[PDB]
Design a protein around this ligand. Structure first.
Ligand code: CLA
Ligand code: CLA
Ligand code: CLA
Ligand code: CLA
Ligand code: CLA
Ligand code: CLA
Ligand SMILES: CCCCCCCCCCCCCCCC(=O)OC[C@H](COP(=O)(O)OC[C@@H](O)CO)OC(=O)CCCCCCCCCCCCCCC
Ligand SMILES: CC(=O)O[C@H]1CC(C)(C)C(=C=C/C(C)=C/C=C/C(C)=C/C=C/C=C(C)/C=C/C=C(C)/C=C/[C@@]23O[C@]2(C)C[C@@H](O)CC3(C)C)[C@](C)(O)C1
Ligand code: KC2
Ligand SMILES: CC1=C(C#C/C(C)=C/C=C/C(C)=C/C=C/C=C(C)/C=C/C=C(C)/C=C/[C@@]23O[C@]2(C)C[C@@H](O)CC3(C)C)C(C)(C)C[C@H](O)C1
Ligand SMILES: CC1=C(/C=C/C(C)=C/C=C/C(C)=C/C=C/C=C(C)/C=C/C=C(C)/C=C/C2=C(C)CCCC2(C)C)C(C)(C)CCC1
Ligand code: SF4
Ligand code: SF4
Lengths: 79, 216, 104, 119, 79, 86, 119, 185
């Protein structure tokens, strides 16, 4: 390095550099696989946020909707 | 009774005796990029020098004069200047792309500043300016963020609500619903259901009175 | 149609230029003009080679002047049947000769 | 050390030149859609459809009414008529129903005129 | 005393706020563009209005505009 | 477009109408005040939002209010000249 | 003026009796041919033996970018002045832009070949 | 329609090969099968580099695998593929000849736009996989080793395009350079 700091030059502070890179190609690939999973989930989340709630679902969607018993208890308790 | 003039499209009327003698400039409407126009037609007793809203000056013909512009603002400014010169017969028209002519400025043949019969107030509010309802009071309603468009009845109702909700000590707290008693919509009379709801409300009030009187 | 007429003009022209190119390939080996092609650089026809090598050899100035002359030329029925047939033959011959020179 | 720069040689361009350019082109293409920004640009078919869906839902079918909440409008009206009868000035022809209708009605034809674009 | 009738709400006044109905032309102006017209004798004109079969720009944004009003909200009387 | 509203404090002096640059306003008969007229805003679609009516209003606080609506901007309210949205 | 009218009318964009592919091809030939030069002469590798080839690559990249922009323009605004009767809107414009990309590649390559061959 | 995405407003067929419905259906079936084989082949190229199944360590990876694997093993693999191709037929009532009732539970009773999106995603991935597998096989044949190992040894630009980038920072392999940095690009 060509240090430009007065304190660095005075005290001889150094930026030690390893001989070998910390992570290997396989480790970087695994991290990238996890990042890809994150990206897919994030795209799905962005789509959901963009489209918001769909109150029409009760007209065509399968099932009859459900409220968890704890959610019902919270509703009964109130705010 | 008012008759709308022919006012041919400017692209069709290349040269007309009506057009006043004017210098010309780059401030005129862009013919390549716009099609909507505004025509102002008046009658002058004498040739008075006047300033075009688009750049230079002009001389109006003795008789009928017609000018073309892009904006009602330009037409109205020219009309104001003509009124200053005491030309009160000027009319303004909007010309669509297809040639339809809409008589605009003396909408009913009488200048707006002069009162005329058959005119009804539009966008008029029956109270002082500060009589408008609070914006936070009508939220998630028709007037979600426009408290200056609420009807007088809505304003009165919201005002009465804010007066009512000051008396905290005696306000009926809405009973908490029993989520257990939920049935499908498919699974009587409206009046009968209202009466049953009223019996339920009276029962709730009696229970509340007993519970509060237990320890007081 | 317009496409057929344009293609006909293009074919006729490509045939004329192909006869010209075939003649210009054939002649130099038999004989070459004398007279110091580029006297400034002491260049002579005997020294210049024949083929794609000429493009590198003779000066860019000379090539540009030839191009300017062609630009001036461009900017400013048994006989015709023979013309077009010979154009086809010359186009085949010139493409073959140029391909052979480039390959080998 | 630094032998992982082969990853950078593919990622730094692909992330800071290719992806931004694709995103910008896609944004320009998206800007010209019928519903470019339907949640902030008034008069969009998607926004109108969403509002109609909310109205279709039973709970929210009349949640936009500022006067919503009256359990017994008939009883409220009857009490209001009794109050106006007691407070009526002598020789008053103003009735509660007529006055309420007049106050509910107004003349504001330029409010949310962009609704036409959607429908 | 306004001849215009509000399409959305008959009780209210028309959004236009005008009192005289529009006048339709004998023949509506057809779409055109300003181009050159070579005179066939060496001459050439600059701004010659010539017919154009369809929209000059077929974008949905351009074509959706009918010019009836600010939002094309005027009733049939606008035409 | 902007929202031009008129309140009953109006005294019908017509100054707003005279100051209108694009003729959005007009006086209409009324009985609320002594002048027996109140300004109206029928052509609010042409309102540009210059608030010259508001400048010319005499009343202690304005009997005419122009509420700007930047989200609903139209070509008439923007005074577009070189480009046409019609 | 007469000269300006004739010149503009005879530009490739305007010339009579030209197919959209002809217009685009000519315009792209010109564009690429002049575009390769700036990178060749003033690029970072202008002094290196690969200056001409790197400049050709940069010019082809510029041609591609402008052609992508033109494709976006024809997909969004969809000019219909080059379209044949009874044809999809902006088909002629898109054809012209694609052939402009082709012509730019060709002109850049031709300029690079001339530079290489004639020093 | 199916197979047409945003970048192409209309169907891409410059040569008008799908003139008739029969030819369009045949080409759709062929394209779907080709894209499927190409997709699995591309993962097939990437994964052996990462790891090898027990007993498959010795075998060469790419086109060299054709010579390395025994002819008997190749015969067995082709026999398995042929048995699958001959003993499996499209499910009755299916979307066409391209489907074989494999995972149709996920697509049954779904909205038609979603089914179209799934089919178009399949086709687009298949097309990109065809392009990528041809790239991988051509590079493997030309440079003698699988593209992934070749990139690990030489980088994204190797021995064919490194000449262009021989003077770039972190990629500078020009003669006399104070650093080689040729294997990092
Ligand atoms: C948010 C955290 C974050 C940030 C700020 C950076 C920043 C950087 N990384 Mg990255 N990186 C991250 C997380 C992050 N990284 C993670 C989690 C990994 C493991 C997979 C990597 C793996 C990685 C490698 C292998 C390399 C870099 C490199 C780089 C540099 C250029 C960008 C690049 O090539 O990205 C590439 C990385 C990815 C595409 C992985 C995803 C990165 C994060 C999670 C994206 C987050 C997006 C953000 C929340 C919202 C964006 C909105 C957008 C629309 C504007 C830069 C210093 C290069 C370098 O060191 O150059 C000298 C390089 O070679 N990064
Ligand atoms: C910034 C870099 C860049 C960009 C944005 C593009 C963009 C493009 N190139 Mg590419 N190209 C580049 C660099 C780049 N190129 C370089 C460095 C070279 C090497 C000289 C090429 C050589 C090249 C060729 C030979 C061709 C393209 C073509 C294309 C088009 C591809 C998509 C298509 O089919 O459109 C459809 C249009 C598009 C205009 C194709 C094209 O012009 O298709 C018409 C084509 O044939 N490019
Ligand atoms: C008729 C036009 C023409 C001509 C005469 C040349 C001539 C040349 N090109 Mg090519 N080139 C052309 C069009 C042309 N190019 C086009 C349209 C492109 C854009 C895609 C390129 C892109 C290009 C590149 C990127 C490179 C060449 C190179 C070369 C050289 C060797 C070509 C060769 O023999 O390949 C034989 C095989 C086929 C030579 C100077 C190479 C060279 O030596 O550059 C200095 C080189 O690196 N050319
Ligand atoms: C003995 C084994 C075997 C058999 C019986 C078949 C049979 C078939 N293959 Mg082939 N195929 C095989 C091995 C085999 N394949 C292998 C090992 C591969 C490499 C993955 C392929 C990859 C392949 C593709 C990519 C395609 C075929 C296609 C076909 C069909 C084309 C018609 C024909 O016979 O020609 C047919 C059902 C084509 C098809 O189905 O067209 C409709 C087609 O597109 N095959
Ligand atoms: C991306 C590529 C792709 C896509 C989109 C599809 C799509 C389809 N294939 Mg398949 N197919 C593919 C590749 C693909 N295929 C390949 C490579 C092969 C060769 C092995 C096949 C072979 C094949 C056959 C033989 C058949 C199909 C059929 C089908 C249909 C099955 C229904 C379904 O839900 O599938 C889509 C489902 C998926 C793509 C799986 C999604 C899950 C992924 C793999 C993991 C997600 C991980 C992620 C990180 C987690 C998300 C977290 C959070 C967001 C929830 C459908 C049209 C059938 C058909 O034609 O029906 C009409 C049929 O018969 N395919
Ligand atoms: C999407 C698929 C894909 C991908 C990701 C890659 C990726 C790669 N290929 Mg390619 N390749 C592909 C498909 C693909 N290939 C296919 C289908 C084939 C078969 C024809 C090949 C054949 C091939 C060969 C023979 C070589 C590569 C090489 C490379 C590497 C360097 C590329 C580079 O930066 O050149 C940069 C090059 C330049 C800046 C100079 C321009 C050179 C020519 C004129 C470019 C022509 C293609 C053009 C860029 C495409 C434009 C768009 C297209 C629609 C027309 C890189 C790992 C090279 C390498 O290093 O391999 C180890 C190499 O020698 N590839
Ligand atoms: C070598 C690299 C090349 C990469 C190019 C990738 C783009 C492929 C598109 C092919 C279209 C093939 C083609 O000819 O399609 C043409 C197609 C025609 O659509 P239209 O509906 O407008 O056509 C009208 C019809 O009549 C004709 O079909 O339009 C587009 O594709 C629009 C392109 C906009 C895309 C917006 C995103 C911009 C991407 C920018 C990426 C640049 C990265 C560079 C890094 C600096
Ligand atoms: C009525 C009508 O219209 O006609 C009909 C008729 C018909 C027949 C039905 C049709 C068809 C189908 C056709 C024409 C299908 C053609 C398919 C072709 C040409 C496939 C090529 C694959 C090449 C590969 C995999 C190369 C792979 C190359 C590799 C792996 C090379 C590998 C190496 O060379 C590399 C690259 C470098 C070398 O040093 C080393 C080695 C290993 C040799 C039509 C025309 O559609 C319609
Ligand atoms: C067929 C087309 C053609 C035409 C119509 C044409 C007309 C004229 C005119 C008329 C106004 C003048 C005055 C003129 C003058 C010179 N010409 Mg030129 N010339 C043509 C072709 C070539 C070729 C092929 C070469 C060439 C050259 C020179 C040199 C330099 C010589 C030197 O090198 O010392 C000089 C002074 C040579 C060259 O540039 O060499 C570097 C060379 O090889 N010319 N040339
Ligand atoms: C389809 C079908 C049938 C079938 C079938 C059969 C037999 C199918 C068999 C399928 C088979 C055998 C599929 C193997 C997959 C292996 C995978 C995906 C491995 C990935 C491994 C990965 C992604 C690991 C990655 C890495 O971690 C590694 C290793 C190193 C780390 O540095 C980091 C990385 C990321 C690089 C039936 C049942 C017979 C009938 C039915 O009717 C239809
Ligand atoms: C004003 C002025 C001026 C200007 C100028 C200019 C502007 C120029 C331009 C120039 C240019 C701009 C040029 C260009 C050219 C080009 C060319 C010459 C090209 C060619 C091409 C080719 C030949 C191609 C081919 C191809 C293709 C197309 C594809 C395929 C392949 C091939 C190769 C075949 C001056 C300076 C004079 C001065 C005075 C004034
Ligand atoms: S708005 Fe103001 S200026 Fe206009 S009449 Fe009313 S009080 Fe007078
Ligand atoms: S803001 Fe200006 S244009 Fe609008 S009503 Fe008031 S004075 Fe007229």
């Amino acid at each position: 390095r060509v240090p430009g700091g007065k304190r660095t030059k005075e005290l001889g502070l150094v930026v030690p550099i390893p001989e070998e890179d910390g992570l290997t190609d396989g480790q970087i690939a695994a991290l990238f696989v996890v990042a890809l999973v994150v990206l897919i989930a994030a795209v799905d989340l962005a789509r959901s946020l963009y489209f918001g709630l769909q109150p029409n679902k009760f007209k065509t969607a399968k099932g009859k909707g459900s409220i968890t018993p704890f959610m019902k208890r919270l509703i009964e308790n109130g705010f | 009774e008012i008759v709308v003039e022919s006012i041919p499209r400017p692209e069709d009327l290349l040269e007309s005796p009506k057009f006043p003698m004017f210098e010309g400039s780059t401030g005129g409407y862009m013919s390549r990029s716009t099609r909507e126009r505004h025509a102002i037609t008046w009658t002058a007793k004498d040739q008075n020098k006047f300033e075009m809203p688009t750049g230079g000056f002009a001389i109006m013909n003795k008789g009928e004069n017609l000018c073309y512009f892009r904006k009602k603002e330009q037409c109205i400014s020219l009309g104001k200047q003509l009124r200053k010169m005491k030309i009160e017969n000027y009319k303004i028209y909007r010309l669509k792309k297809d040639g339809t002519v809409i008589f605009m400025h003396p909408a009913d043949g009488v200048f707006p500043e002069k009162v005329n019969k058959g005119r009804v107030q539009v966008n008029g509010r029956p109270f002082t300016i500060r009589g408008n309802p609070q914006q936070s009071e009508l939220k998630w309603t028709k007037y979600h963020m426009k408290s200056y468009e609420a009807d007088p009845l809505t304003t009165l109702f919201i005002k009465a609500r804010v007066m009512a909700f000051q008396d905290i000590p005696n306000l009926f707290a809405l009973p908490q619903p029993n989520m257990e008693e939920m049935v499908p919509v498919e699974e009587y009379t409206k009046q009968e259901y209202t009466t049953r709801l009223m019996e339920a409300l009276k029962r709730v009030q009696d229970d509340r009175k007993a519970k509060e009187a237990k320890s007081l | 149609s317009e496409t057929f007429r344009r293609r006909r003009i293009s074919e006729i022209k490509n045939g004329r230029v192909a006869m010209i190119a075939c003649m210009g390939y054939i002649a130099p080996e038999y004989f070459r003009w004398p007279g110091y092609c580029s006297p400034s650089t002491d260049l002579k026809f005997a020294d210049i080679p024949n083929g794609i090598q000429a493009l590198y050899k003779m000066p860019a100035e000379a090539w540009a002047q030839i191009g300017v002359f062609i630009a001036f030329l461009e900017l400013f029925r048994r006989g015709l049947e023979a013309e077009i047939n010979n154009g086809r033959l010359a186009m085949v011959a010139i493409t073959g000769m140029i391909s052979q020179n480039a390959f080998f | 050390y630094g032998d992982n720069r082969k990853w950078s040689a593919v990622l730094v361009p692909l992330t800071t030149l290719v992806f931004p350019a694709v995103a910008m082109g896609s944004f320009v293409l998206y800007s010209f859609q019928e519903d470019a920004f339907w949640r902030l640009v008034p008069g969009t078919k998607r926004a109108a459809e969403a509002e109609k869906a909310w109205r279709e839902h039973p709970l929210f079918k009349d949640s936009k009414d500022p006067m919503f909440g009256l359990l017994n409008p008939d009883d409220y009206e009857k009490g209001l008529e009794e109050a106006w009868e007691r407070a009526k000035p002598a020789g008053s022809t103003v009735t509660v129903k007529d006055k309420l209708k007049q106050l509910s009605k107004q003349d504001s034809p330029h409010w949310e005129s962009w609704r036409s674009l959607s429908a | 005393s306004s001849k215009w009738v509000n399409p959305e709400d008959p009780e209210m006044s028309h959004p236009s706020g005008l009192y005289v109905l529009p006048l339709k032309p004998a023949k509506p102006q057809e779409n055109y563009i300003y181009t050159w017209k070579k005179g066939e004798d060496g001459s050439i004109e600059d701004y010659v209005k010539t017919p154009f079969k369809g929209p000059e720009r077929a974008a949905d944004y351009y074509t959706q505009r009918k010019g009836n009003g600010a939002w094309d909200h005027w009733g049939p009387q606008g035409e | 477009s902007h929202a031009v509203k008129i309140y009953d404090t109006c005294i019908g002096c017509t100054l707003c109408v005279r100051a209108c640059p694009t003729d959005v306003l007009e006086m209409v008969p009324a009985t609320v005040n002594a002048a027996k007229q109140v300004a109206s805003s029928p052509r609010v679609e042409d309102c540009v939002g210059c608030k010259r009516c508001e400048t010319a209003c005499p009343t202690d606080f304005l009997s005419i209010r122009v509420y700007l609506q930047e989200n609903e901007e139209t070509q008439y309210s923007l005074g577009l000249d070189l480009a046409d949205w019609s | 003026g007469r000269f300006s009218k004739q010149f503009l009318a005879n530009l490739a964009f305007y010339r009579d009796g030209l197919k959209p592919w002809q217009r685009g091809l000519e315009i792209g030939m010109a564009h690429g041919y002049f575009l390769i030069g700036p990178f060749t002469s003033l690029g970072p590798l202008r002094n290196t033996p690969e200056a001409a080839t790197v400049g050709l690559l940069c010019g082809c990249a510029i041609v591609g970018l402008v052609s992508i922009g033109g494709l976006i323009f024809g997909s969004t605004i969809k000019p219909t002045r080059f379209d044949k009767e009874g044809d999809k809107p902006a088909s002629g414009f898109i054809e012209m832009i694609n052939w402009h990309a082709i012509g730019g590649l060709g002109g850049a390559g031709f300029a690079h070949a001339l530079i290489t061959v004639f020093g | 329609a199916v197979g047409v995405c945003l970048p192409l407003t209309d169907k891409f067929d410059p040569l008008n090969l799908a003139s008739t419905d029969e030819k369009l259906e045949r080409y759709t079936q062929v394209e779907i099968k080709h894209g499927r084989v190409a997709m699995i082949a591309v993962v097939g190229y990437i994964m052996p580099e990462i790891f090898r199944f027990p007993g498959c360590e010795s075998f060469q990876h790419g086109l060299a695998a054709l010579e390395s694997i025994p002819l008997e093993g190749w015969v067995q693999l082709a026999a398995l593929v042929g048995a699958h191709e001959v003993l499996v037929k499209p499910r009755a009532g299916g979307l066409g000849t391209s489907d074989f009732g494999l995972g149709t539970e996920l697509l049954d009773g779904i909205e038609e736009p979603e089914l179209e999106r799934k089919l178009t995603a399949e086709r687009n991935n298949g097309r990109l996989a065809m392009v990528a597998i041809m790239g991988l096989m051509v590079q493997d044949g030309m440079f003698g080793e699988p593209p992934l190992s070749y990139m690990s040894k030489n980088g994204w630009w190797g021995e064919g395009v490194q000449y262009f980038v021989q003077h770039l920072n972190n990629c500078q392999s020009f003669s006399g350079s104070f650093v080689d940095n040729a294997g990092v690009c």
